[PDB]
Each structure stands twice: as C-alpha cells, then as structure tokens.
Design a protein around this ligand. Structure first.
Ligand SMILES: O=C(c1ccc2nc(-c3cnccc3C3CCCC3)oc2c1)N1CCN(c2nc3nc(Cl)ccc3o2)CC1
Length: 289
C-alpha cells in the first residue's frame, strides 16, 4: 500500500489523489451544525496544514467547514520534498479539492485563506475562477519577495537556468527573522514535518514564477479580501501588500498593517496573534451572516 513519506498508509488517513497520481494528505474541521460556508486553508513553503490547527478551529467555531491539504512535496503528501514541476500544480490541486468539496456540500460559499507562498496560491486560485470565491484571507502573502533575497537568489537561478545543476540549493532561512515570538520559532524548528533545509534552486525558480503570475493576475482579481501584513516582514516584502491593495480590482479590499511584526503573523507575539485571529473572525463573520 501507498504510504506517506513518514511511512503511514494513505488508507489510514484522509487523502485525495491529484491529477499526476500523487496522494495528498487532507484535513477537515467541520461544525456539528449545518455549515454556513466552506474555507480552504493554503499553507506556505516548507510547512504543512497541521500548523493551522488553531486558526481552523476558530473558523469551525464560526460554523464554517474548514478543509486543507499538504501541497505536493510537503508534509504528509507525496512528492520529492520541496520540488514542483510547475507552480500551477499547487493551484490545480487546490481547485480539485475545492471542486470535490463543493460536490459533497453544494450551495455553500467558498473562501480561501493563505499565508506566504500559500497566499500566492490563493491569489492565483481566485484569479482562475473570477466570481466563484466569496472571499480570501491573506496573511503575509507572497506578492513581492524581499528585494535583497530576490536579487541574490536570481544569481543562483542564472546558474540553474543556463546549466544542468539539479541539486543546487540556497542557504537556509533564519527562522528567527520570521517571528518575534521565540516560542513559536522553537516550535517551528522542532516540527519534523517542516522542511527547514535550504531551498532547492529549482523550487525558488517556481517561487519567482509565482511572483510573476501574481503580478499579471492582480488587475483581474475581483474577489473580496482581507490582507494582513507585518511592517518588518523579511520574506514577503510589505511593498507587495501595498501593491496588492493598489492594483487589485476587488471592490471589497482591506489592509491591516502590524507595526514591527515579522512574517508569521498568526504565530507572532500574543498581542499580534490575538488581533489576527479576531480580525479574521470579524471579517469572515460579516461575510457569512
Ligand atoms: O511560504 C513561505 C516562503 C515564502 C517565500 C519564500 N522565499 C523563500 C526563499 C528562500 N531562499 C532563497 C530564496 C527565496 C525566494 C525565492 C524567490 C526569491 C527569494 O523561501 C520562502 C518561503 N514560508 C516561509 C517559511 N515558513 C515559516 N513559517 C514559520 N513559522 C515560524 Cl513560527 C518561524 C519561521 C517560519 O518560517 C513557512 C512559510
């Protein structure tokens, strides 16, 4: 039997098989009552859907049916770690899962929530289906990379794009520069499902493709969205959040800036994280009433 990269049979776990024949590990949090709407949670690079437990339980408490999967190459899903043939695979697979859930639970509005790379995935997913999603919640979405990191990486990208160098990698990200909450940093560094090795250059190239596709997608994006962004984000430059507010055509767009906060806003200092949860609660509540 087919097993996760951690050797657990998929027959023992919630799962979906994608269009490439790869098993994706899935998670669901459903309310006891009749659901008001569906919401897919889209995680970021190197992490996995289990990192969203608290946010998902909050959303389920609003009577939404929350669902997620680990993207290919991540967590408990199949695929070479941190490899993707093309960035659109992630979007395709979100749409498969959304479509499957809307068959099982028809008539319900569907929301997206995405953080970091998962926010770029959410933007591209909404852009592919104009008018179909009720709303999107974006926590520090990948819109523009940190300009310094992007320039340095595009050097390594020059090597890989012009030569055959399948194993070249960037240096690892310093997990401390992504949340001021030292306890959350230590938890991140302790999670065996997180890939904290340096990014394979081929994967960073797909992240560059994500940035390029997001830019082209903005002037067509019409979905309602809430955008939460820290002013001291060393990974997803806050300039991208301002560009998203400016260039999206959405009639319902809201930006909240967290002054001095780092990248992982839902795992930041307690004052920030409590506000993040409250603001998402209010925003989704107002749009599922
Ligand atoms: O989605 C992402 C993400 C988004 C954009 C990225 N860009 C690169 C990158 C890396 N090396 C060279 C070049 C590049 C770019 C390639 C194009 C130009 C630059 O890596 C990225 C990862 N992330 C961040 C790490 N995560 C995380 N969660 C966490 N939680 C806690 Cl508590 C503490 C720390 C945490 O770190 C999960 C969510």
């Amino acid at each position: 039997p087919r097993r996760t990269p951690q050797s657990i049979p998929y027959q023992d776990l919630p799962h979906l098989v994608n269009a490439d024949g790869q098993y994706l590990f899935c998670r669901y949090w459903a309310p006891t009552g009749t659901p008001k709407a569906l919401i897919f949670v889209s995680h970021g690079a190197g992490e996995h859907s289990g990192r969203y437990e608290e946010l998902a339980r909050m959303l389920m408490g609003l009577d939404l049916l929350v669902f997620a999967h680990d993207h290919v190459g991540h967590g408990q899903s199949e695929g070479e770690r941190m490899v993707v043939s093309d960035f659109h695979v992630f979007v395709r697979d979100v749409l498969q899962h959304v479509d499957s859930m809307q068959k099982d639970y028809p008539g319900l509005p569907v929301f997206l929530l995405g953080h970091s790379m998962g926010g770029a995935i959410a933007i591209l997913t909404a852009a592919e289906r104009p008018g179909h999603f009720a709303g999107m919640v974006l926590i520090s979405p990948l819109v523009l990379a940190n300009p310094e990191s992007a320039t340095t990486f595009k050097v390594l990208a020059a090597k890989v794009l012009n030569s055959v160098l399948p194993n070249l990698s960037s240096g690892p990200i310093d997990s401390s520069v992504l949340s001021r909450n030292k306890t959350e940093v230590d938890i991140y560094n302790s999670d065996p499902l997180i890939c904290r090795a340096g990014l394979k250059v081929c994967f960073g190239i797909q992240l560059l493709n994500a940035v390029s596709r997001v830019e082209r997608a903005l002037p067509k994006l019409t979905v309602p969205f809430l955008l939460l962004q820290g002013s001291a984000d060393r990974l997803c430059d806050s300039k991208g959040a301002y560009l998203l507010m400016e260039l999206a055509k959405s009639q319902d767009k809201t930006l909240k800036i967290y002054e001095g906060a780092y990248h992982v806003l839902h795992k930041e200092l307690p004052e920030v994280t409590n506000s993040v949860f409250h603001e998402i609660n209010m925003w989704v509540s107002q749009r599922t009433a």
